[PDB]
């Protein structure tokens, strides 16, 4: 019984921490695409100004 008590006490916190780390990693992965699009805005703004 106490075995399962400790198993819960460990697993629940591990999952709760995993939620936060997964959210932050998901944000970090797509920050690159967000910025590259934001600057491709100006890239295209000038690549059409030449026209």
């Amino acid at each position: 019984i106490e075995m399962a008590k400790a198993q819960r006490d460990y697993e629940l916190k591990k999952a709760a921490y995993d939620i936060e780390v997964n959210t932050r990693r998901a944000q970090a992965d797509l920050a690159y695409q967000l910025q590259v699009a934001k600057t491709k805005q100006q890239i295209e703004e000038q690549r059409v100004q030449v026209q």
Binding site: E2, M3, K5, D9, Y10
Partner: protein
Amino acid sequence: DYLSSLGKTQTAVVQRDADIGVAEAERDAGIREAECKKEMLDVKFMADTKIAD
């Protein structure tokens, strides 16, 4: 086999006592070993929780 039959009465009484004693000893060993295992798992899981944090 008169006498061999007559010895049957107590040839098992000592075996009875030996079985009772070994059963009690194994019971005590098992209970206290389970207690030790429980305590060590609790502390190990607390340490692992801190590591996870």
